[PDB]
């Protein structure tokens, strides 16, 4: 190859030829704002970079074609990033989220590798032929750490170091190199952190570092330079280019920097998702976050039960497992103000209301197949609840004050509730019994009400002891209805019939705005307190703080694994009972058909038609 030196500065990535020593040219990119960490992939000569202003990781070819953003969510300060050229994996470290993560080079199958007791991981270096990765930490007590490249066997390699940067492996000579930003030194050690040596002690401000053949290269922010010296003696110092202020990173682009082999290089280890290098020449198959590795040690299966919780501009997933796996952002594009969420466990698709767009939208959990279900004539959806058997979304409309019903593919079913003085807000459906529950925020008269799923059999359950009942949940197994009142700052429950009303919690609650049932636990979100909390409906283990310091909480929704055999025993799950619009569970074990308020049931007693 032609050996190239690439460097980031401001919003540009530029290249200097190392055989001509002075030919400088910018990579023709658009949309970069703050270019930071750099790497490349030897097999296709793609370049990769992070951006601290956009909080993204992107890749492109050096002529600017195939510009793609491969990581776009869940980053804060992605200051370290490296390409695993053998397994075709992308690694990065974030000083904001305190995480080291991996994905495929196109961003698929993101997994969190290190997150516990991690204080600002900054500079990252990979050795996939051996199976180790190395990084510096800038938090608390700075240090250089080592782990397997599946995140296991984490150990401290260099304990006595300042904030360090430009961590670089000389793969040929088995040396580590870095700059110390607190002592302004360039140092080297062997792969075990031993045989330490100071390479240069007379540089005022060495920031970035890399290595190629007999030379180390660095940037100096006080000398506004990229410079080069003999990697063992520190001599033969030369100026690669001057008048370059604040160069954030430098990278030697040459195939000799990415050599070697591991099993991942040949058929990805027969791994379905990730092939991760593990120490001394090994490999292990890995899975996206919250997935599990099957008994064949090669294939991954998605989680069957989990918790979803939304913020203003993010939807997250949480699992309750022994590993205490971290929560993960879902990579759903174009969220602006998420107000409410739901999930279809049949087709495994997430649904949400965005009150900036006044839209109901849906996508798969990996963020693909984004689709608009409801859109504007002025609508303003407030809450939504899916009937998974008839395959309908029930949702409340704040502008027109109706309950409207829509098929999962966007075709409208119709409104089932409307009254001049009605203000339907929170809603949850119980298709197992044929009922729907909603809060009704009438002026000076808030209510909790229930009705059949076609709007008939409407009755007020509760009208006293309510100020702003803002969220509803229910559980068929427990046979219970749950609500939060953000004004009275308390959580209540009753039987689904409305009997046995009881306050569950009213202490240390500031602004409860959502709640959900997961097995025997009632979870809720406290917006003002920035917390998720849960309580045990059996009364045995009490009340637990699930996660704190979560800003802009908007909704929470638990997903239990679908019992497919049991699902298909619901009468409305088979062809909607033959009903064109609404299928009602009678309670006789039988089903009758019904219609939205603008249509009439026809003679076949299955079809709805336009009124005479």
């Amino acid at each position: 190859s032609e050996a190239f030196l690439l460097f980031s500065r401001r919003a540009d990535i530029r290249r200097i030829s190392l055989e001509t020593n002075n030919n400088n040219v910018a990579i023709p990119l658009t949309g970069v704002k703050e270019a930071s960490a750099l790497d490349f992939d030897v097999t296709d000569n793609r370049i990769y970079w992070t951006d601290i202003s956009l909080k993204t990781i992107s890749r492109a070819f050096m002529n600017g074609s195939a510009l793609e953003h491969v990581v776009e969510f869940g980053l804060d300060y992605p200051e370290g990033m490296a390409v695993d050229w053998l397994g075709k994996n992308l690694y990065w470290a974030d000083t904001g989220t305190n995480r080291i993560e991996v994905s495929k080079l196109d961003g698929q199958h993101r997994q969190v590798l290190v997150w516990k007791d991690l204080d600002s991981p900054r500079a990252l270096a990979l050795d996939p032929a051996e199976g180790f990765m190395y990084w510096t930490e800038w938090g608390g007590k700075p240090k250089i750490d080592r782990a397997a490249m599946d995140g296991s066997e984490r150990t401290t390699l260099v304990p006595n170091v300042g904030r360090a940067n430009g961590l670089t492996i000389d793969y040929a000579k088995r040396r580590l190199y870095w700059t110390d930003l607190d002592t302004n030194l360039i140092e080297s050690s062997n792969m075990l952190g031993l045989n330490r040596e100071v390479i240069a002690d007379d540089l005022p401000h060495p920031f970035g570092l890399t290595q190629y053949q007999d030379y180390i290269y660095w940037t100096d922010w006080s000398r506004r330079s990229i410079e080069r010296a003999n990697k063992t003696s520190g001599q033969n110092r030369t100026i690669i280019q001057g008048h370059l202020d604040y160069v954030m990173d430098i990278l030697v682009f040459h195939s000799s920097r990415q050599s070697g082999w591991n099993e991942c290089a040949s058929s990805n280890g027969h791994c379905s998702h990730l092939c991760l290098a593990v120490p001394v020449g090994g490999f292990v198959c890995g899975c996206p976050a919250h997935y599990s590795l099957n008994a064949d040690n090669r294939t991954c299966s998605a989680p069957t039960t989990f918790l979803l919780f939304s913020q203003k501009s993010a939807i997250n997933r949480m699992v309750i497992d022994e590993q205490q796996s971290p929560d993960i952002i879902l990579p759903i594009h174009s969220l602006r103000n998420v107000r409410a969420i739901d999930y279809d466990p049949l087709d495994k698709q997430l649904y949400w209301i965005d009150s900036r767009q006044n839209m109901i939208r849906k996508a798969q959990e990996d963020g693909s197949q984004g689709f608009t279900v409801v859109v504007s004539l002025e609508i303003q959806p407030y809450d939504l609840s899916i009937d998974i058997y008839s395959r309908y979304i029930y949702w409340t409309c704040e502008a027109t004050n109706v309950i409207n019903v829509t098929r999962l593919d966007g075709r409208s079913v119709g409104v089932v509730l409307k009254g001049e003085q009605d203000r339907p807000r929170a809603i949850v459906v119980n298709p197992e019994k044929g009922y729907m529950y909603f809060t009704n925020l009438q002026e000076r008269s808030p209510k909790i009400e229930r009705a059949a799923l076609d709007g008939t059999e409407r009755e007020v359950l509760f009208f006293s002891g309510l100020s702003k009942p803002i969220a509803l949940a229910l559980d068929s197994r427990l046979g219970k209805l749950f609500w939060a009142d953000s004004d009275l700052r308390r959580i209540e429950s009753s039987d689904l019939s409305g009997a046995n009303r009881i306050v569950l919690e009213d202490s240390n609650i500031l602004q409860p705005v959502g709640l959900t049932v997961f097995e025997n636990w009632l979870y809720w979100i406290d917006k003002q307190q920035q917390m998720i909390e849960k309580i045990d409906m059996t009364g045995r283990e009490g009340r637990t703080k699930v996660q704190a310091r979560i800003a802009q909480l908007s909704d929470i929704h638990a997903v239990k694994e679908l019992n497919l055999q049991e699902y298909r025993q619901h009468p409305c799950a088979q062809d909607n009972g033959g009903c064109s619009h609404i299928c009602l569970v009678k309670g006789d074990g039988t089903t009758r058909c019904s219609c939205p308020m603008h249509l009439v049931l026809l003679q076949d007693e299955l079809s709805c038609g336009e009124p005479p």
Binding site: R10, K33, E34, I52, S53, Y77, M248
Partner: peptide, 15 residues
């Protein structure tokens, strides 16, 4: 640009 400086640090062309 200049987010990194804002966290860890100023230069011109920043703000």
């Amino acid at each position: 640009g200049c987010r990194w400086f804002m966290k860890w640090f100023p230069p011109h062309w920043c703000g």
